[PDB]
């Protein structure tokens with residue numbers, strides 16, 4: 001038996017069912033594009049189960065006794081095993097709606113609702129968007145300007161170089177302040193779409209005004225192509241960095257998040273993901289333990305209290321879960 005919630009089981013970075021999980025995740029993504037949130041979550045959960053299995057699924061008899069494997073997800077896997085291909089998945093892959101929604105939603109600053117609006121309005125290509133600049137936010141204009149680099153996978157080598165410049169800037173602005181790599185790279189991923197850093201300082205309040213100073217330093221080194229600073233709920237800067245490379249450079253998306261140290265463990269847990277892992281952890285918290293978990297805290301709605309955590313381990317323990325290190329949160 002395998003546990004129901006993704007937060008009750010390890011899900012490693014690498015697994016034995018990548019074809020099958022990829023196919024289910026296409027159907028999940030397509031569901032999300034049509035605003036079908038139930039169906040998205042259902043396909044995502046089924047894919048997550050396959051990622052946690054210790055062996056490849058070679059016959060359909062191997063699906064027995066697994067949670068979150070309803071009829072639809074089972075049929076998809078059956079067709080893949082029997083025929084090498086699933087007609088429904090192939091139809092989605094080839095469909096103009098899916099291809100265009102994927103194209104648009106990938107762009108920096110574009111979500112499903114915006115992409116769907118553009119689709120409905122007859123826009124299909126990146127050139128179409130460039131022909132209608134009045135339809136674009138400044139963030140989206142920047143995403144289009146750099147779209148080729150931003151759809152080139154970010155590599156661990158890029159992350160190391162970025163972490164060095166961010167750490168240098170943070171250390172020069174405020175000795176004692178720290179930078180923690182989060183997101184998929186903290187989970188062990190070799191590649192990604194962006195780089196996530198969480199900044200804090202051990203004395204509560206000493207992080208105030210730090211991010212604009214960090215950004216000034218980075219901007220004055222020529223490292224920033226785009227920056228949008230927002231005070232609000234954590235202070236954050238949504239950035240495109242200009243990463244120097246041997247003979248050239250590439251644009252890379254970087255999010256910088258500042259958390260006061262009291263909230264740091266919650267922020268680190270939240271920002272480390274995976275997105276499905278954290279959704280599952282929050283559902284577990286609410287449904288099984290009666291507590292509301294988010295990136296800022298863990299709230300008991302009946303007692304009107306907040307849990308004091310020094311680490312992620314504290315939070316897992318308080319929720320009655322075995323601790324999972326970040327590399328086992330790849331749900």
Ligand SMILES: Nc1nc2c(ncn2[C@H]2C[C@H](O)[C@@H](COP(=O)(O)OP(=O)(O)OP(=O)(O)O)O2)c(=O)[nH]1
Pocket residue numbers: 182183184185189191192193194195196270271272273274275294295
């Ligand atoms: N708690 C919380 N988490 C967030 C928020 N926004 C993003 N995250 C989480 C979900 C992600 O797993 C993680 C970083 O988001 P990403 O889109 O970078 O995902 P991740 O880095 O895991 O995959 P990637 O390889 O970058 O596509 O932070 C937020 O407002 N609150």
Ligand SMILES: [Mg+2]
Pocket residue numbers: 182183184185192193194195196
């Ligand atoms: Mg990331």
